[PDB]
Structure formats: structure tokens, C-alpha cells
């Protein structure tokens, strides 16, 4: 079914953001595991899987709309050097992603691509859940102190 | 995550309506139970619980958006003194609630808070199902007569 | 069964305290959840549910006694801005509640409404258990430190 | 254990009321069953059984206190001639019974027989629940009409 | 169905005997339990329950025959002051009861109320089984001695 | 929670009575078992356990009320030299215990410590049941004779 | 079986130590529970129970040996005012207890009461396990710090 060219460009932009996130979150996960912070590692792993599932849905939608899904271009990964930076890097990436999601929804609404809008809204709900997790972790580091926060994520 | 100030004000207005509904429905339920109309009492209790769940979701959303959920200001309860009046009081409250939900959704759309809009759309679906229930009960009173209607809600 | 007018007034005062506590505890619960302190959030949630069940019993008793349960007036919520203050706000509310419960029981006894007395005694038992909980949490914060206390309430 | 003479006298007065209630409710039950109002007949049978259980407990307490339980004297049954009157008869009996229970509890408290008071308070709670049932049934007769009310109690 | 007036009068006389027995056996039961003779107390409780079941059936039959079941008049209880006397009291009551049952059956047969006769015969069989139990217990007291007999009824 | 000083003194006096009863019942139990009267031994053992459970509740209440539970002072044990005396010693102890319970309940009521009253009433109900048991055993000894009574408590 | 008089005196001395320990550990348990240190409270409760079981075996042995078990004399409880002091009070008691156990075993061996020796040796094994627990707890406070040690004992 022939989709709106600009819808497909927006979907490819969102996909590009998900592809960055997949890799950034997977590397952060394996860094935490290597450091022995296995609870952070497992949770970041699951965040990476979630972004993989969103990427799948975006790829499927673009193909249905007779576009070419862009898996070739990979933007800049934001990799932290300690737990605090890694969480902040994830959050900065998520805030860019939700800005881009909002602009894409605006355009889907204007051209009546209501199914693409519904998909983007579901993804946005997932990303806002991830923002909530990240903001809460950074707040916990303040409330319990960094040593305790790391301790609580060892096992 | 920093929410739109007026979105938060709208969410607090909806929360205010839910808080009224919780108490109005809880009292109507216990009145109906006291009167021996336990099928009305039990159905109205479930309506109160549903409003409790909507309030919970609004409180959670407001806190995520870095606002203050107002659980202090309670508006006017519409308490009836007989079965038909209590149903009409619930209906009047629900029609006010859905008007407010539509205005809040408009503003959520205008500032691109699509997750808040989706939460409110879900609440609106629940309130319209309650409106359907209430209009149907009021119609049943007309069709089967008040005495039969009450008889059918004793057990 | 028409009850004593002042008994019903006492029951509505107790109910009014329970209504404040429902909302105060529910907001504190959701604040703690928002902050990542989910074990505190869950325990405070269950305190709010407990007060909802007390409010229900009071409403039922007032209706049986042919009075009007007051769900319209809501007194001042005591909302804290950090964990220690939130617990202390809950404790201050509970100490007001148990004083009111004692005065109500005295009056029930005087007018021989022994069933209302028994209901209030059961509610008083629950509120003293909550006071025990709150005083103990406040003591634990002093013994293990706030950072450790909060750490121990991160995961449910 | 040697109980207070006036406590035992109060306990025997409460027992006397329960013995009336047992017989009154059992006959009402079987009248309703004979008339085809089997839901009323079954509910009233369970009220009779409950009064039998209360009488058992009173008998047991009187004997522990070294009194003689009075099962010989039977006061006046209040038997109605139609469903409304039968429910009202039960209610009139319960209102007398709860008055007597309150006076007995007063005296138990004065002479420090706290266990007898506790037993009487538990009975008082059951009797107030019965009064609630009866008042509600009589209100329903007015709200749904006598014909509908009886229709709703034909089948169990 | 309109029953024979004198049949109903006989049925009310049998019902009166059962109402005595219910109360007599229930009190004896609770006396034995208070004294620590719990096997006697339990057996006598089950005798009381059986008389309650017979009274139910008589009440139901009287109402079917369009009579008024008499639950207001209660004859003289025979309460013993020790185990032997209590058993003898039950026996004296049962021998009066079976005499009355026979006279009632005679009249049912004369006026062709065969269903009432059948109900009374079933009750008569239960009462003769009770007489057998009682006579046997009294014989055992003589054969094993009072002290042994009571010893054998301490534990259930 | 700061308790009434005289309530706490009453609670410590009741606790004192329970501590005597724990030890008196436990010794009587083990004496009966040593004599081969194991049904008496077992029943008296369960009486001792019950008093232990009451003592626990009293200790917990005293600490909640910010008092010091007195586990140091132990009053006079009433130990019998035969079964009849042992039962009578238990009964003498229980009759003192229930008198003290009533005086403590009076004071709880006067100072509106309704929860302490409720605890004491529950303990009083248990002690009255123990009195019933003991009075009944002593009556059975007279009805069946000592040799049969003891025989019935061998196995 | 007529036991050695001095064995019985030693058994009564060990019993006296156990009676102190029962009460001291029970009170420490309930203090920790009140303070919200429930893992410590539960563990100390089980220590108190273990001492109850030892006391029972000693009482039973003394009676078999035809002695009088002394449950009247209760020595000085060592009650701490904070966690470190309570642990050290428990340890001081246990060290006195095991010294007395060794002296009692020596005497049992000398008079050939090998079964009493075996009983005391089993108790000594239990008390040495308690000493290991206590010394380890005090060492952990030094290694992880008091605040962390207490944190780790908040939740069962
Ligand atoms: C801020 C206002 C309130 C909120 C946010 C709230 C929230 C809730 C929630 C989330 C539940 C659990 C529902 C479920 O998933 O099963 C609940 C249950 C309940 N609520 Fe409320 N509630 C509020 C006020 C009240 C009031 C005023 C009453 C009664 C006067 C009440 C009575 C109850 C009862 C009886 C239950 C069922 C508890 C049980 O037995 O499990 N609630 N409430
Ligand atoms: C002193 C008077 C009475 C006493 C103490 C008494 C006591 C009791 C008790 C304790 C029960 C058992 C209830 C339970 O735990 O489930 C019972 C059952 C019953 N009683 Fe009575 N009752 C009395 C009078 C009567 C009378 C006058 C009748 C009939 C007219 C009656 C009919 C019954 C019946 C039908 C049952 C149910 C038996 C079953 O389990 O099927 N009772 N009674
Ligand atoms: C002579 C002194 C005591 C002796 C010989 C003794 C003996 C015993 C024994 C044998 C048990 C059962 C243990 C098992 O489960 O196998 C027990 C349980 C118990 N004891 Fe003691 N005890 C004594 C004093 C105390 C005291 C002073 C208290 C409280 C202050 C106490 C509180 C308890 C409790 C709470 C239980 C558990 C009961 C249950 O719920 O099963 N004991 N005791
Ligand atoms: C998937 O598109 C199709 C749909 C069709 O119906 C028929 C053919 C095609 C493939 C056309 C060549 N595609 C390339 C080539 C290089 C890199 C990329 C892609 C791409 O599609 N995404 C990349 O990253
Ligand atoms: C959710 O509040 C917070 C979030 C935070 O992250 C930090 C602090 C606060 C507390 C600030 C005082 N809040 C009050 C005070 C009084 C009444 C109400 C409230 C409210 O929020 N709703 C009411 O009904
Ligand atoms: C005796 O009735 C009245 C006397 C008056 O002077 C004025 C109005 C009424 C009936 C008003 C119906 N009941 C209401 C109404 C609103 C709120 C509540 C209730 C209630 O019962 N609990 C509430 O919170
Ligand atoms: C509880 O009776 C006892 C307890 C004892 O420990 C020793 C003896 C007795 C029986 C004394 C004669 N009792 C009668 C006699 C006739 C009617 C009644 C009663 C009665 O007790 N209630 C009645 O309705
Ligand atoms: C079976 O009664 C009825 C059947 C009907 O179909 C209609 C009406 C009646 C009630 C007439 C008044 N009955 C009383 C009154 C007082 C005492 C007794 C009774 C009684 O019946 N037995 C008593 O001990
Ligand atoms: C529960 O006591 C406390 C509560 C606190 O919050 C803080 C400290 C304490 C310990 C104070 C010393 N207590 C002793 C000393 C010796 C004997 C006894 C006791 C006792 O309490 N009962 C006895 O039998
Ligand atoms: C176990 O005693 C016996 C064994 C028998 O075979 C025969 C009689 C007796 C009782 C002799 C008086 N006993 C008392 C008296 C007071 C305190 C204590 C005791 C005691 O034994 N331990 C105490 O703490
Ligand atoms: Fe109808
Ligand atoms: Fe830590």
C-alpha cells in the first residue's frame, strides 16, 4: 500500500533512533555485567530487547508502505564511562527520540495515516516508560548514595 | 519529565472529578446495600473501584510529569435520596466528567502530549460505558416500572 | 435502628480522619513509587487500603444507625516532602485519630452503644499497629541511616 | 467458679429471650414454608438456629458460674398472621432483647465480670445484625410492593 | 388439607412432649459436659437434636392439616441432680411419651389418618430405641459400679 | 507510643503471674510424665505453652508502650506433692491471676487504654477456661475416685 | 533411679543457667522486633526456644534421677541497651554456661553417670554453636560497620 513519502522518512528517522538505542543499551548492558553489576546489566539488556522489538515493528510498517527501511545508517552512540554517565546518556538519547516521535505523529495526523500514528504512540509510551525508569535511577543515586546504588545492583 | 503546565492542570481537574465520583458512588453503593438492593449496591461498588483505579493512573501520570496531584480539594457530591435520583445524579456527574475529558484531550493534542491523551481516551471510554449503563437503567425503570426494577435488584 | 445523635457525630469525625488518611497515604505511596522506593510505596499502599476498609465499616454503621455518612468534608492532608517527614506526617495524623477514637469510645460506653464501641476498638487496634509501624520506621532511619533505610526499600 | 448472683439472673433473662426467639422463629419458618415462601422459610430457619447457638453459650456460661439455667419458663411468643406482621413480631422481640442485653452488660461491667460482658456483646452484635435484616425487609415491602416482595421469596 | 380436630390435638400433645424432651436433654447434656462427663454430654446432645427433628416433623404435619402448632406451652422438665437420676428422668419422660404416642396412633387409625399414624410410628420407634439406651445405661451402672460407669464416660 | 505508667505496672504484674504459671505448669507436667500419668502431663504441658504465649503478648505490649518488661523477678511457685494438691495449686494460682486481671482491666478502662484492656480480657478468657478445667478435674476425682481418675490419665 | 546427689546439684546449676538464658534471649528477641530488626529478633527467638528445649531435657533427667528440679531460683539477666551490648551480654552468659557445663561433665564422668554426661555434652555442643554465632556477629559489626550490620537484619 503506497505510503506518504514524508511519513516514511519520519518512520526511518524513528528507526534510526531505535537502532542507536539497541547498540548503546546492549553495550551498556555488557559493560555493567563485566563490572559485576548484573542487575543493571539484566535490566539494560531488556531495554535493548524492547528497542529491537520496536525496530522490528517500524521495519514491517515501512515495507508495508512500500518504503525502504534504513538499517545502513547508524548515528552516534552515547556511551558513558561510569554508571552515572551511562544512565544520563540513555536519558539524553530517549529525550531526542521522544521529540522525534512527536514530530512524526504530527505529520501522520496531518496526512491521515492513523495506523502509523497509533504505532508511533505505542512506541512513545514505551519510551516515556524508559524515561521514567532512567529519571528514577538518577534520583535513587542521589537518595541512597552511589555506593549503595551500585551495591543494590550487584546481584 | 517536565510536563506542560496546563496539561497538568487539566489532569488535576479530571482527578478532581474522579475523586468526587469515588465518594458519590461508594455512598450510593452502601445506601443501596442498606436498603436491601444488593445488586445495585454491588454494581455501584464496582463503579467506585473503577474510579479509584482511574484516579491512581492520573496521580501516577501527574507525578511523572513533575506536578502535584491535588487530593485535597473535593468538589460537590451529587447524592440522591432515592434509586432513580441516585442514578440520575451519577449520570449528571458523568456528563460533566466526559465534557472535561474532551477539553483536556484537545489541549493534550495541541501541545503534543500524546501519552496523556491516550490515558484520558482510555478513561473516557470507561466513563462512556458507565453512561451507557446509567441511561439503560433509567430506561429500564420506565419500561418495567419502578417496583419491578427495584425487585430485580434485591438479590 | 435510630442511633444516638452524638454517637453518629463521633463516627463521622472518625470517618473524617479515615478519609484524610486514605488520601494522604495514597499520595505518599505513589510519591515513594515515583521515587523508586517501591517497598515503601507498597507498604503505604496497603496502609491506604486498610483505611479504606475502616471507612467502609464506619459508613455501614452510620447508615444502619440512620445517620448520614459525611464523605463531603475533607480535612487537611499532611503531605511530607521527604521520607522522614512523610512518615512523621502519617504518625501525627494517627495520633490525632487515636485521641478521637478514645473520646468516641467513652461516649459509646456512656450511652450503651456497645456494638459501635466494639467497631471503634477494632479500628483503634489497627491504628495502634500503624503507629507501631511508623515509630519503628522512624527509629530504623536513626539506627541504619537514611541512605541504608531507603536502599532497603528500593525493591519490593 | 462462683458467679455474681445478679449477673446469673441477667444471663437467665437473656436466655429466656433466646428461648422465645428460637420457638417464634422456628414456627414462622415452618409457616412460611407451608405457604410456599421458601426463601423466607429458609432464612428464618437459620435465624432460629443462630438463637439456639446463643442459648447454648448462655447455658454453658451459667453452669460455669454455678447457676441454674432456666429452661422451664417460656415467655410469650409473638406470632404474626401474615408476612409483614411476622417480620414485625421478630423485630419487636429483637428490640426488647437488645434492651435487656444492654442492661445486663451494664451490670457485668459494674461487678467486673468481663468475660460475661464479652459473650453478651457478641450476642448483641448478632441481634443487631438481625434487626438490620428485619428493618430492611420491611422497607423492601414498601419499596417493591407486597406482591413483588412475596414473589421474590417463593423459591430458594 | 383439613385434618381431624382430635388428631391435631393429639399431635400437639406429642409435640408438647418433644419440647420438654428437647430442653431436658439439652440441659442434661450441658450439665454432663460441665462435670467432665463428655461422652454422656455428647450422647445426650444427640438425643436432644433428634427430638428437635421430631418436633420439626410434627410442626410441619400440624400446619399441613391446618392446625396451630403449640410451641407456647411447655410442660414440666424432669432434671436430675446426679447421673443416675438424670438418666431415670429421661426414662420417665420417654415412658410417658410412648404412652401418649400409642393413644394418638389409636385415634389416627380410627379416623383413617394413615399418614399421621406412619409419622407417629416412626417417632415411636426412635423413642423405644432411646428407652433401650437408657435402660441399658442404668443396668450398666449396677453391673460395673457407679465409679467405673462415670469413668467410662469422661472422654469422648 | 508512651503508655500510662500505672497500666505498664499492671501489665508487669500480670506478666509476673504468667511467669510463675509457666514454670509451675511445666514442672507439674514433667512430674506427671515421670509418674506415668502422661495424659495429665500432656494437658499440663499445653497449659504451660498457653501461658508462654500470653507472656509473649504482654512483653510485646509493654515494649510498644515504652516500658521495661520485668522478666527478672519470679514469685513463689505453688508445687504440689500429689495429683490432687498439684491441681489445687494450679487453681489457687489462677484465682489470684484472674483477680489481678480484673483490677488491671479496671485501670485500663479508667485511662482509656482500650487496646490493653482488650488484650487482658482475652487473657482473662483463657484463664477462666483453665479454671473450668481445674475445677472439673477436682470434681471428677470425687465422682470417679482417685484410683480411677489416675488410671484414666495414664495413656 | 536414685541419682548421685552432686550430679543432681550440677544438673540444677545448668538448668539455672538455661532459665536465665531463656528469659534474656526472649527479651532481647522482643526488643529487636520492636526496633524493627526482625531478622535478629527471629534468630534470638529461636535461641530462646533452643534453651527451653535444653531446660526440658534437664528437668526430665533430674526427675528420673529422683531429684527436685529448681525452677524457683532465677539468676541475674544480662540485658543490653543496644545491639552490640545485647550480643556481648549473650556471649558473656554463654561463656559462663559452658564453663559450668565442663565442670558438670567432669563430675558425671567421675561418678560414672555416663548418660547425664552425654546429655550435657549435647547441650555443650549447642552452646558452642551459639558462641560461634555470637562471636561472628560481633566480628561482622567491625567488618561491615554497625549501620550496615543493622540494615542486614531488618527484614526476615
Ligand atoms: C484517593 C481516593 C482513593 C483512591 C486513589 C483509592 C484507590 C483504590 C485502589 C487502587 C484500590 C484497589 C482496587 C483493585 O485493584 O482491586 C482500592 C480498593 C478499595 N477502596 Fe479505594 N481508593 C480511594 C478512596 C476510597 C474510599 C473513600 C473508600 C471508601 C469509603 C474506598 C474503599 C475501597 C475498598 C473497600 C476497596 C477494596 C479493598 C479490598 O477489600 O481489597 N476507597 N482503592
Ligand atoms: C433449649 C432449646 C434449644 C437448644 C439449646 C437448641 C440447640 C441447638 C443447637 C446447638 C443446634 C446445632 C446448630 C449448629 O451448630 O449447627 C440445633 C440444631 C437444630 N435445632 Fe435446636 N435448640 C433448641 C430448640 C429447638 C426447637 C424447639 C426445635 C424445633 C422446634 C429445634 C430444631 C432444631 C433443628 C431442626 C436443628 C438442625 C439439626 C440438623 O443439624 O439438621 N431446636 N439446636
Ligand atoms: C521453664 C521455663 C520454660 C520452659 C521449660 C519452656 C519450654 C518450652 C518448650 C518445650 C516449648 C516448645 C518448643 C518446641 O517447639 O519444641 C516452648 C515453646 C514456647 N515458649 Fe517456652 N519455656 C519456658 C519459658 C518461656 C518463657 C518465659 C516464654 C516467654 C516469655 C516462653 C515462650 C515460648 C513460646 C512463645 C513458645 C512457642 C509456642 C508456640 O507457639 O508453639 N517460654 N517452651
Ligand atoms: C528492502 O527494499 C526492497 C523492497 C523490494 O520490494 C524490492 C527490493 C528491495 C531492496 C532494494 C535495495 N535496498 C537496500 C540496499 C542497501 C541498503 C539498504 C537497502 C534497504 O532497503 N535498506 C537499507 O539499509
Ligand atoms: C506530590 O508532592 C510532592 C512531590 C515531590 O516530588 C516532592 C514533594 C512533594 C510535596 C509537596 C507538597 N504537596 C502537597 C501538600 C498538601 C496537599 C497536597 C500536596 C500534593 O501534592 N497534593 C495535595 O493534595
Ligand atoms: C437530612 O438530609 C439533608 C439535610 C439538609 O439540611 C440538606 C440536605 C440533606 C440531604 C442531602 C443528601 N445527602 C448528602 C448530600 C451531599 C453530601 C452528602 C450527603 C450524605 O449523606 N453524605 C455526604 O457526604
Ligand atoms: C443445673 O442444675 C443442676 C446443677 C448441678 O450442679 C446440680 C444439680 C442441678 C439440678 C437442680 C434442679 N434443676 C432444675 C429442675 C427443674 C427445672 C430446671 C432446673 C434447672 O437447672 N433449670 C431448669 O429449668
Ligand atoms: C400457625 O399459625 C397460623 C397459621 C396461619 O395459616 C395463619 C395464622 C397463624 C397464626 C395465628 C396465631 N398463632 C399463635 C399465636 C401465639 C402463639 C402460638 C400461635 C401458634 O400457632 N402456635 C403458638 O404457640
Ligand atoms: C527492654 O529494655 C530496654 C528498652 C530500650 O528501648 C532500651 C534499653 C533497654 C534495656 C534496659 C535494661 N533493662 C533490664 C535490665 C535488667 C533486667 C531487666 C531489664 C528489662 O527491661 N526487663 C528485665 O527483666
Ligand atoms: C518435683 O517435686 C516433687 C517430686 C515428687 O516425686 C513429689 C513431690 C514433689 C514436690 C516437692 C516440693 N517441690 C517444690 C516446691 C517449691 C518450688 C519447687 C519445688 C520443686 O520441686 N522445684 C521447684 O522449683
Ligand atoms: Fe414482578
Ligand atoms: Fe549498605
Question: How far apart (Å, rounded) are the C-alpha atoms in residues B1 and D61?
Answer: 67
Phi-psi domain of D12 (left: phi exceeds 0; alpha: psi -120 through 50; beta: other): alpha
Return the CA Rg of chain F: 17
C-alpha cell at G50: 533452643
Exposed, middle or buried, F59 (CB in 10 Å: 0-12/13-18/19+)?
buried
CA distance E77 to chain D (A): 7
Collect all residues with Cβ–Cβ distance below 8 Å to G112 and sequence separation of at least 6: none
The subunits that touch chain F, with at least 3 C-beta pairs less than 8 Å apart, are C, D, E, G
Collect all residues with Cβ–Cβ distance below 8 Å to E58 and sequence separation of at least 6: E11, E14, E15, E18, E69, E119, E123
Angle at alpha carbon of residue B40, lines to B37 and B46, rounded to 5°: 140
C-alpha cell at A18: 531505535
Collect all residues with Cβ–Cβ distance below 8 Å to A57 and sequence separation of at least 6: A119, A123
Phi-psi domain of E153 (left: phi exceeds 0; alpha: psi -120 through 50; beta: other): alpha
- Cβ of D71 below 6 Å from ligand 7: yes
Question: How far apart (Å, rounded) are the C-alpha atoms in residues G98 and G70?
Answer: 19
| C-alpha D25 to ligand 2 mean position (Å) | 12
G150: which chain C residues are within 8 Å (Cβ-Cβ)? 143-144
Collect all residues with Cβ–Cβ distance below 8 Å to E84 and sequence separation of at least 6: E138, E141, E146
| CATH architecture assignment, domain F1-155 | Up-down Bundle (1.20)
Topology of domain G1-156, CATH: Ferritin (1.20.1260)
Neighbours of B70 (CB within 10 A): 19
- Cβ of A69 below 6 Å from ligand 4: yes
Query: Which of B19, B68, B73, B74 for mutating ligand 5's site (highest number of atoms within 8 Å of CB)?
Result: B68
Q: Is G148 annotated as a binding residue?
A: yes
| C-alpha E70 to ligand 8 mean position (Å) | 8
C-alpha cell at C53: 476498609
By C-alpha distance, the chain E residue nearest F140 is: E36
Answer yes or no: are the C-beta atoms of G34 and F68 closer than 8 Å. Answer: no
Angle at alpha carbon of residue G33, lines to G32 and G39, rounded to 5°: 80
Answer yes or no: are the C-beta atoms of D148 and D32 closer than 8 Å. Answer: no
Find, among A125, A135, A133, A60, the residue nearest to A97 by Cα: A125
Find, among D11, D124, D118, D132, the residue nearest to D68 by Cα: D11
Neighbours of G64 (CB within 10 A): 14
**Please, what's the b/e burial string for E87-105 (b: 16 or more CB within 10 A of its CB; e: otherwise)?**
bbbbbebbeebbebbeebb
Q: What distance, in Å, lies between the first and last C-alpha atoms of chain E?
A: 46
Q: Is A107 annotated as a binding residue?
A: no
Find, among B93, B86, B95, the residue nearest to B128 by Cα: B95
Answer yes or no: are the C-beta atoms of E156 and E40 closer than 8 Å. Answer: no
Q: Does any CB of chain D come closer than 8 Å to the CB of residue E45?
A: no
CA distance G140 to chain C (A): 15
Q: Do B154 and D140 touch (CB under 8 A)?
A: yes
Residue with cell 487500603: C49
Cβ-nearest to G36 among C139, C145, C148:
C139
For residue E52, CA distances in Å to E24, E55, E90, G44 come to 12, 5, 15, 56
**Please, what's the b/e burial string for B100-128 (b: 16 or more CB within 10 A of its CB; e: otherwise)?**
bbeebbebbeeebbbbbbbbbeebbeebe
E63: which chain D residues are within 8 Å (Cβ-Cβ)? 30-31, 34
- Cβ of F140 below 6 Å from ligand 3: no
Compute, in degrees rounded to 10, the torsion defined by CA atoms G24, G29, G32, G36.
-160
* CA-based max dimension of chain A: 55
C114: which chain F residues are within 8 Å (Cβ-Cβ)? none
For residue G25, CA distances in Å to B24, G84, G140 come to 53, 14, 20
Find, among B75, B74, B105, the residue nearest to B10 by Cα: B105
CA distance E37 to chain F (A): 8
Find, among C122, D116, C109, the residue nearest to F121 by Cα: D116
* φ, ψ (nearest 5 deg) of residue G107: -70, -40
Answer yes or no: are the C-beta atoms of E81 and E16 closer than 8 Å. Answer: no
- Cβ of G33 below 6 Å from ligand 10: no
C-alpha cell at F93: 494460682
- Compute the 3-state secondary structure of chain G and give helix, strand, coil in percent, each to the nearest 5: 80, 0, 20
- Cβ of G79 below 6 Å from ligand 9: yes
**Please, what's the b/e burial string for A34-53 (b: 16 or more CB within 10 A of its CB; e: otherwise)?**
eeebbebbebbbebbebbee
- Cβ of A71 below 6 Å from ligand 4: yes
Question: How far apart (Å, rounded) are the C-alpha atoms in residues F32 and F42?
Answer: 9
| C-alpha E19 to ligand 2 mean position (Å) | 11
C-alpha cell at F122: 482475652
Q: Does any CB of chain D come closer than 8 Å to the CB of residue B55?
A: no
Question: How far apart (Å, rounded) are the C-alpha atoms in residues E77 and E91?
Answer: 12
Q: Do C152 and G154 touch (CB under 8 A)?
A: yes
Question: What SS3 class is residue E154?
Answer: coil
Find, among G83, G77, G87, G76, the residue nearest to G33 by Cα: G83
Answer yes or no: are the C-beta atoms of C70 and B100 closer than 8 Å. Answer: no
Q: Which of residues 6-35 of G touch F (CB under 8 A)?
A: 23-24, 26-27, 30-31, 33-34
Q: Do B114 and A131 touch (CB under 8 A)?
A: no
F106: which chain D residues are within 8 Å (Cβ-Cβ)? 112
| C-alpha F87 to ligand 9 mean position (Å) | 35
Collect all residues with Cβ–Cβ distance below 8 Å to C76 and sequence separation of at least 6: B72, C20
Question: How far apart (Å, rounded) are the C-alpha atoms in residues D68 and D63?
Answer: 6
- Cβ of D81 below 6 Å from ligand 8: yes
Find, among C104, C77, C70, the residue nearest to C93 by Cα: C77
For residue D99, CA distances in Å to D119, D151, F86, F130 come to 16, 34, 44, 32
Q: Do C106 and F118 touch (CB under 8 A)?
A: no
**Which of C20, C23, C68 to mutate to test binding with chain B, by most B CBs within 10 Å of its CB?**
C23
C-alpha cell at E132: 433401650
Collect all residues with Cβ–Cβ distance below 8 Å to G34 and sequence separation of at least 6: C136, F60, F63, F64
For residue F58, CA distances in Å to B76, F68, F119, G76, G121 come to 48, 11, 8, 21, 35
CA G24, chain centre distance (Å): 9
- Cβ of F69 below 6 Å from ligand 9: yes
Q: Do B36 and D136 touch (CB under 8 A)?
A: yes
By C-alpha distance, the chain C residue nearest B36 is: C64
C-alpha cell at D97: 432483647
Q: Do B35 and D145 touch (CB under 8 A)?
A: no
Residues composing chain C: 156
C-alpha cell at A89: 546518556
Q: Resolution limit in angstroms?
A: 1.9
Neighbours of B150 (CB within 10 A): 25
Neighbours of F155 (CB within 10 A): 8
CA distance C6 to chain G (A): 37
For residue A49, CA distances in Å to A13, E65, E146 come to 19, 81, 85
Question: How far apart (Å, rounded) are the C-alpha atoms in residues D87 and D134?
Answer: 6
Answer yes or no: are the C-beta atoms of G23 and G78 closer than 8 Å. Answer: no
Find, among B37, C30, B35, F91, the residue nearest to D2 by Cα: F91
Would you kindly state where each structural domain of chain E is located, as residue ranges?
1-156
Exposed, middle or buried, A16 (CB in 10 Å: 0-12/13-18/19+)?
buried
Question: What SS3 class is residue B70?
Answer: coil
Collect all residues with Cβ–Cβ distance below 8 Å to F33 and sequence separation of at least 6: F41, F42, G60
Residue with cell 538505542: A21
Amino acid at each position: 500500500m503506497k505510503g506518504d513519502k514524508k511519513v516514511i522518512q519520519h518512520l526511518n528517522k524513528i528507526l534510526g533512533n531505535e537502532l542507536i538505542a539497541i547498540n548503546q543499551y546492549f553495550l551498556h548492558s555488557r559493560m555493567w555485567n563485566d563490572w559485576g553489576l548484573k542487575r543493571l546489566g539484566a535490566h539494560e539488556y531488556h531495554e535493548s530487547i524492547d528497542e529491537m522489538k520496536h525496530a522490528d515493528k517500524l521495519i514491517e510498517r515501512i515495507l508495508f508502505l512500500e518504503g525502504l527501511p534504513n538499517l545502513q545508517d547508524l548515528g552516534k552512540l552515547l556511551i558513558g564511562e561510569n554508571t552515572q554517565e551511562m544512565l544520563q546518556c540513555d536519558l539524553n538519547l530517549e529525550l531526542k527520540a521522544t521529540k522525534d516521535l512527536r514530530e512524526a505523529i504530527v505529520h501522520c495526523e496531518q496526512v491521515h495515516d492513523y495506523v502509523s500514528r497509533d504505532l508511533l504512540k505505542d512506541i512513545l509510551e514505551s519510551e516515556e516508560e524508559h524515561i521514567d525508569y532512567l529519571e528514577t535511577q538518577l534520583g535513587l543515586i542521589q537518595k541512597v548514595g552511589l555506593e549503595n546504588y551500585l551495591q543494590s545492583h550487584m546481584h
